[PDB]
Write a protein that binds this ligand. Sequence first.
Ligand SMILES: [Mg+2]
Ligand SMILES: [Zn+2]
Ligand SMILES: [Zn+2]
Lengths: 94, 256, 48, 151, 56, 281, 65
Amino acid sequence: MRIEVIRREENLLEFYLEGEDHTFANLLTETLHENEHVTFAGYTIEHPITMARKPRFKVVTDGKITPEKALEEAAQKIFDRAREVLEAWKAAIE
Amino acid sequence: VEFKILEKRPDSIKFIVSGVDVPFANALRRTILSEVPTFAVDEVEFLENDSALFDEIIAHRLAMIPLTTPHERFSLDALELDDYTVTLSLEAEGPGMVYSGDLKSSDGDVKPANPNIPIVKLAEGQRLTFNAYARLGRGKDHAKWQPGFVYYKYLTKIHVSKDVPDWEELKELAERRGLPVEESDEEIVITTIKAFYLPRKFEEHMGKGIREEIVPGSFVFTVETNGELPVEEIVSIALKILMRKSDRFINELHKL
Amino acid sequence: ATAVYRCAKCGKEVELDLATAREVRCPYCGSKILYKPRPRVARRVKAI
Amino acid sequence: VCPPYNADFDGDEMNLHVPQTEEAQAEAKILMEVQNHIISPRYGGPLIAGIQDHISGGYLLTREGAYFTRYEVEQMLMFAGMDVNELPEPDKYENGEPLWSGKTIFSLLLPDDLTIWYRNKLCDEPERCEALEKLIEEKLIPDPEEVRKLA
Amino acid sequence: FRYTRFEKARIIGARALQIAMGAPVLIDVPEGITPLQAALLEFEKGVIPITVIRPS
Amino acid sequence: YNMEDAVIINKASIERGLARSTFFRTYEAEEKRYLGGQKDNFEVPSPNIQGYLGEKYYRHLDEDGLIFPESKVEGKDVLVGRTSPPRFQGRRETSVTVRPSEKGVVDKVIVTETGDGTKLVKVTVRDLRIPELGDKFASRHGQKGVIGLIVPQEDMPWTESGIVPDLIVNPHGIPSRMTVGQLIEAIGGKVASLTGRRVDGTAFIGEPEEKLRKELEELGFKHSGREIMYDGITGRRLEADIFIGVIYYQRLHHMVADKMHARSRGPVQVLTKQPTEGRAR
Amino acid sequence: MIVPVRCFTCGKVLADKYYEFKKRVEAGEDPGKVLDDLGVERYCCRRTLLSHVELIDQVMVYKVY
Ligand SMILES: [Mg+2]
Ligand SMILES: [Zn+2]
Ligand SMILES: [Zn+2]
């Protein structure tokens, strides 16, 4: 996992995510959608062959919180949800 | 988050997950399909091969053979996989059948799960000797490392009003196809735990007579395995992989 | 510079010198078609 | 670029040539670039244009009753490479979720000072186009709300 | 007075050929670019010294 | 990526051995005899002779001048080491080599004699041909096209019954060519797979289409052959019921491996001083 | 010329149960019921098992050495 920043405006953050694909990117984007302070959140794959493992992101906030902070909260929410689902699965198996 | 195990089998499991969002289910399915690592043959060193099949064909057939993956010994949820190599060797002389169970593994925990898989046929005077090397890998790089097949569907309830003619035919069809049916005085409800398709005569009633509703956040998952890993450990491994990926992304964000 | 070859029909081992061969034939069955046997050295083949 | 070449993908092969001199490279870059030959000189019309899937997708997007969610709009904006940083005002709300009409998303492609009206191949009721034409002719700057009423 | 496409192409080719065998660039250019790119940048900046002779 | 007759193939299906092919090429070499007792020799050429290709080109040759079987070879690799008497000096080099754009593994070596008693050596080289971009694929109903994109199984759509397509074809190519037999064949293939009995498709006496639709409806699927599919990337249900079936697809010999040619500089014709013709030369 | 180890679609192993399926089919049993009894549910695996033709025995008779 490597982050390569494309451009940074006053409230916009564009970056690459090397080593990832649609699986993590779509989850991260839809978790960012849950934040009320995020106005724009989207990802795309520039080329399915050359850029297969390098999606491009774009996070825009309303200025209340930074886009990096929004991404951090989205990742923490993903972590907590995955832990809760794992706990429920472990409880239901036994 | 709640789980309801519909059916448990040694090779597959069916369950309903609730309280989860659609891209989360998609991410879990993709992590199970392509991110959960197993043991598979990657390189074969051939000493002699007098069989009709070529070396590449035999190597590919050996790669398709499932191998038991000890989840306790190796951290399968780690982002970096262990570079542990397991050597499988065979020395067979024809005539006869060469099975997957005839391979001699250097590790007890890493052996072919199915010992009745044919590999090649040997004629009289034909011998096959090779050393097969197996290592951990992910399903995204090659299909030989996939732990199994996984898919899910929306948990939908089909409401058929009693005013619709021949509703008893639909009820008995749903009962025959193993679907839960709830009967009331006004309408019947069919829980689509499997793929349910209405006949042609009921297509005209789907606009106003028969209505299908989708339960929000409920999915019916089907996870299968070929013997490489237990069918319950794959979901836990995928969830731990997602947790580790989130932690790594947080670390990269802090690095920024 | 002699070498060992395998007969195409009978399959038995045939040894002769290609440089100074008056006739390329199997002394056992008379077949004039021979197969060069595979070397016993190991080779690495990628599994797809 | 397929219609200029009359090329499909059922086994077609094509030739590539690399210029070696600076003059040849400059001539190729200035005169023979792809974007410089969009209009065909044979009939004075577009040659490098959209094809079957592009036309079908445009019809699906811009047809009446076509609405998209915020996630779909953001994903298609990122996929198309459009320089859009904030979404426009939602056209309607369904079950508490905002929705965007496909015409609104398609309008982001056009320049802000572009105005044109014509009849397409889907016109089977000329009586509906007659009212629009009369409204356009009468005022020449019709109200957007009035146009959408009889769209 | 406006340049035709043929005249512009000929001017760019001549300038790129000059840059390839000497003729240092009259404007600042980014490193690692081709002489054709340098000629195109010079034309965009409106600094080209090559004129066009037309019949009269 | 499937527009204009192009097709999309599953990555996992390819990795599991679907449409896997092997290409064979046979090379021959003869120890020709000339007038005056001069004849060719089957041996590894010495570095001091003229026309020496290089040390690494004879690395697979045995001491009799013949390549060992099951040896990996590349372009311009020597298979049979041969020398020829000089013309009007040392012996020249006339070894038989692999084509520059071809490669593979030596399958077999045949040692025999011609009708005049001269030595004859035949070498067969096999190359593994895993399907890739540009490989021509055609159905039995005249629908042909090359592979446009290889898509991983995770990104591929799946049905409610757990079916992932092996191939994806564009809907724009079907009705323009008026090919209903392809749809009938897809329905019949799905019915045959579900029931276990092969569907007869003989002309004018084949199984009727309506019977196949009725059987498909009785099997628990839609009569039209459409199934509810989910998007591979987004994970959401597709807004339309996608037509999916089993169609017999044939891989043609028009492979991109044998068709890719790239020339920068090389041999020219003696008469015209112009580049030669053909990828082999 | 030999039965594939895994299904080309979902990777389910089918080569272990192919010979039993062929033996039961040649005995007069219904191939659909035989496939159902062997755990072959999805029609892609049924496609792989039904459409396979064994031809390796016809290749073994020719020696290459
Ligand atoms: Mg064509
Ligand atoms: Zn013999
Ligand atoms: Zn299958």
